[PDB]
Ligand binder design. Sequence first.
Ligand code: MG
Ligand code: MG
Ligand code: MG
Lengths: 134, 133
Amino acid sequence: HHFDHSFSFDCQDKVILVVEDDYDIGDIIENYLKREGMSVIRAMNGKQAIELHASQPIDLILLDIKLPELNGWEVLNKIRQKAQTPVIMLTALDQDIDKVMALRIGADDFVVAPFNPNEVIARVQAVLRRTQFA
Amino acid sequence: HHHFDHSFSFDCQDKVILVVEDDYDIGDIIENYLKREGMSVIRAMNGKQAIELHASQPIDLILLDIKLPELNGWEVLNKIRQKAQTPVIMLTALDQDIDKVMALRIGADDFVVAPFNPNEVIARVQAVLRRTQ
Ligand SMILES: [Mg+2]
Ligand SMILES: [Mg+2]
Ligand SMILES: [Mg+2]
């Protein structure tokens, strides 16, 4: 190739808050993120997610749209009062896509389950790149 | 309590989507869903058609297949970007396609992974159109 169109984005030490009540999906995501050198903080419900976000620098949040007692946009609304941290919504239902697209306080992206975990990594990298200097 | 704003879909109406897809049936279906939501569609079946139609028609967004009969989708993307920075969403199907999306120095505006969820395709097109003025 005579031209340089490709590269490897450096994610080392980026801190990802993974908010997911499903243990196995959360574990899969965590394992894939760590393979890229990212640091992972786990939250299994929204009140925990809000407290962990408030007490620590976070580069990106992967946020379940449906938690046991809060909807994802309720968590995002509270997080946004503390910081402009990028958020990718984890969805599953086509109705979830409608909700995300219509948010007044929007997410940076979404991903639709079931997913190849490599898709999640790609979307995390894309949002981290767009918000590198935000 | 009101968390939503449903006007965002109306902003996509009449925007022009260049759908570059080598499978006639897949492109027919994608076109139908995009038109159902009020967008307009121009169809290209290979890279040469994509380059000609992009050069001559006002295009708001390109939906770009990776596997194409001559130039592949990555090579078409490079030829398109030599002339203009038109937003692009890649239609991917293999893990290796996801790797290549991640490696792009000038990122694709989005991508979607087969099998294609048609409501996800609609939503990602709308989201990129909104982000790119
Ligand atoms: Mg869950
Ligand atoms: Mg999928
Ligand atoms: Mg195809």
